[PDB]
Symmetry: D2
Subunit: 274 residues, 4 copies
Amino acid sequence: SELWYTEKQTKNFGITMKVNKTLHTEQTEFQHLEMVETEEFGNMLFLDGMVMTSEKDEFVYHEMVAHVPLFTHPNPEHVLVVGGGDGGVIREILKHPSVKKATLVDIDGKVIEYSKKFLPSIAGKLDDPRVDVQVDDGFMHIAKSENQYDVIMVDSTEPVGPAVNLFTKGFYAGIAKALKEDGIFVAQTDNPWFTPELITNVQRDVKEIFPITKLYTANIPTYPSGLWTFTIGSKKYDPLAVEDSRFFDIETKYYTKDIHKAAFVLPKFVSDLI
Amino acid sequence: SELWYTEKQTKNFGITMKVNKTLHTEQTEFQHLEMVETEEFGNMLFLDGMVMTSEKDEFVYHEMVAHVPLFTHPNPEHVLVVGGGDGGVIREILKHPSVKKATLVDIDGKVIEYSKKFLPSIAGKLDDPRVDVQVDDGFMHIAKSENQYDVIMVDSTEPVGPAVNLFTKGFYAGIAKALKEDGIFVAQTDNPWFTPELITNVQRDVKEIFPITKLYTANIPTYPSGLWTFTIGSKKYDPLAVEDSRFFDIETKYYTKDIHKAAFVLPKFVSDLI
Amino acid sequence: SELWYTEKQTKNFGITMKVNKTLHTEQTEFQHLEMVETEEFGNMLFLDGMVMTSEKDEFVYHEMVAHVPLFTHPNPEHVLVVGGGDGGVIREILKHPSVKKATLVDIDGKVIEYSKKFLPSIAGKLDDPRVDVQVDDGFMHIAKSENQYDVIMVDSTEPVGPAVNLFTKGFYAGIAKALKEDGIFVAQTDNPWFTPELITNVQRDVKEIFPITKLYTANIPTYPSGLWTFTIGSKKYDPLAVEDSRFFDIETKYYTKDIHKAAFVLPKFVSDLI
Amino acid sequence: SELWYTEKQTKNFGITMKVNKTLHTEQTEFQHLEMVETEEFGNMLFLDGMVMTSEKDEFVYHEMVAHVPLFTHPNPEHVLVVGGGDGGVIREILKHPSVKKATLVDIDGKVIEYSKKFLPSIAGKLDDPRVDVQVDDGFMHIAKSENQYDVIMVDSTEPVGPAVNLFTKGFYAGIAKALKEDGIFVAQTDNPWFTPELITNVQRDVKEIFPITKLYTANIPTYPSGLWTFTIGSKKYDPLAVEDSRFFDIETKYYTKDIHKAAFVLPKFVSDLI
């Protein structure tokens, strides 16, 4: 059996996964959903031909997107996840007792449906009382929020649909508006090997509105280049100033209080981008 | 043109590079040598179907294998590189003034020959007076050395051919014998996602003979999983105790005095292996 | 979406089909069954990683295996299909009014099951009163038959399991035994580009027992090289001597009374094999 | 070594050849030339990512394009090959003593150059005194010819560049003009599985100007579907009326006097196209 799913992460480079069978294939109003069972990583979800998560390595992205900003915040209580259909970031947010309510907003309800069905270990906490799942825009949702959230984790850094975010460089100012006075927001910002421009631009644009703008790193083997990047915009708390007593035992497979600080130590060529 | 070179890094997973043309293809006494021109990474050298280096990302491996142990050592003067045919580690070793002589030992002279020819930016320093290039075993060379080297960077951790290294768990004790009383040695020790057993075993076996045994990390996009691992066996100096004044300006694209320490902060699942 | 199924028809050459989703994947007592939906050919069935049929091109094999021997026979009434799980040859056999009963014998009932389910246009006639489907050996079945069939269409030319066919070069003499005095048998005998030896051997071995041994051709785009070969062993009727009045209107997409004769005109290099 | 060259003969289907090394890669004024050494077929030439010929199967195309029209003609003496850079059709034309002069016109001189160098068994006769090689347009050449040729074998059926062929449906009438009063022309016209429209259109357009318009077939394993098609436009001689005494011993590996007629017996679905 030679059934392989290939992702050309670049016109000239990519990864190829051996597939045992497809679990669900569907063209949505928004994208092409494909849950597949791979031999190497277990069930893997692809959106528009690109890898979203897999059972085997999903923990890196989910833990690093959630825990760095939550522990940076002295006491996160109201959190927003935009575009986290698979529910993985929500699963990690719930490990923080301080969180009163975690809202999840994703335009595609079919991502949530099939993740609950085929990625139970990732989407199994969406049914939790502390979670409020909403199938809606997300960018529209941020546009309509005013100092409601302590931490906001965002999927895409480029709004599509109602770009009511007409603030200068709209999006980031839109997020600042939705965040409380000492809010924090995180956005994945690709890899430094094939799309380094994105890191420079986002880093500069976010800095225009947040006094604290840092960039951290993590290894995701299923993502382009194996090195993923995250931009953290903070209004008041420095992620590198976290008090040791602030941490508490939490079950993770990647994140560590030390990794928390070490993820901000960038390889020379990556610092050069900012 | 759809000419692609695929490396099945696992029976069920791999990377695929678009190739413009092959530069040199030859079956050696030792291995299958293939220099190829890739569109994404420039010239790339493959040995027995596996990626060795490429012009675009070679700097990570070369810098992290060389600089971590050299700066850990208060004053490296006599260094040995076993298996560094492409000459990249030698190129980095020469950036340290303290180095009086750097010996390179590789069984395949054809790797050295074609790297000089197609990877000039990597092999261009092998003609330097401070370098002594020897086309010979390497394991036999270590077996026949007695406290001659300050730092020894090793390619493979498993000796083939004359396994005269009959010391208990031979190899490492063989290396301790070739090293000076305060010597340091480094050996790449694969990735933690597909061959985690190797990290556990090497880490344990090296610890049996060196008082200091640490494991550090680096991102190599062309290597399995994007996260590569390195084992450092030290007889006296701690890589995490390097004095700030010890560092000096050196031209690198990845390595940093901070990366030096941060590379030893392991993701939770990786620490679990040791 | 870059999900492709590749068949290395040779260690150095093959075809690659874009897949939309898998329909059924199962490891049987006998083989690895994989029904898949391809974008180019519709549903396609693979057995042990090799293409069996597809909705788009199945007609060539089914028509040429069935019609050449049936029309060569002045009046076929009792026909046997060994290994025709997908029911395609049976579908074609039923277009001949003279056929009183068509027996289908296949070891894997799961091939019949899933072909009925996903290849209805091919397996839809297996429920016909004139058909007798038996999930059993096939070679054992031929070994236990004595002048019962007018025409026998065989899948593999090499018996596995009880090789009770101990007649000199057993199989063909076993088939002659199962055939009536003026019986005819047909067996696909691969392509002349990558496995030409098989054509020489079979042609010679069949000739040892049947006075008439011819080889005919057909284009199957999903099979190795695009040119497939069929061996016809006849005890009395010459496929090239068919009377014009013998033919009658029959619905086909490939086979023609003229193709009937033209399929036996071999390219120079193919004649050289026999 | 897993270096493979894939040709997506359709967005959803293709063939993949294992490559040992590239021989020559060059971007020409006209196209992307790639001579490559494959393990399965020997040296293979690709133009714009599509297979042109290979040492192993080149004989089919070359023989069937040449010999069918030459033997159909009672006495071919002046022959034109448009776009036969590799020189294979020329090699076959020279097997006919009646041919006084064979003109070859190809826009890309580099195809001729590298075919002579890497495909000697195909291009080795272009240095023959009876051959007149011209690196020039081809369509311009046909536009400027007036009853000069007995047989004209054409590469593409769609003129590019100076479309001075303004005759009704220009091209074919342009060819009739270049042909002598009893001339014959042949043009490959793809396969019936993926581009059947082309066969219908060309067949109809050619019939508009030649009293005799037939379509013949041949198996080329390296071309889409394994079944290639050829359109023959004749002003007077019927390719199916060739006298037996007309043939003479000629060395070929595919073509045969019988194949000559059998190639015109089309599978039912192919007849349906015309």
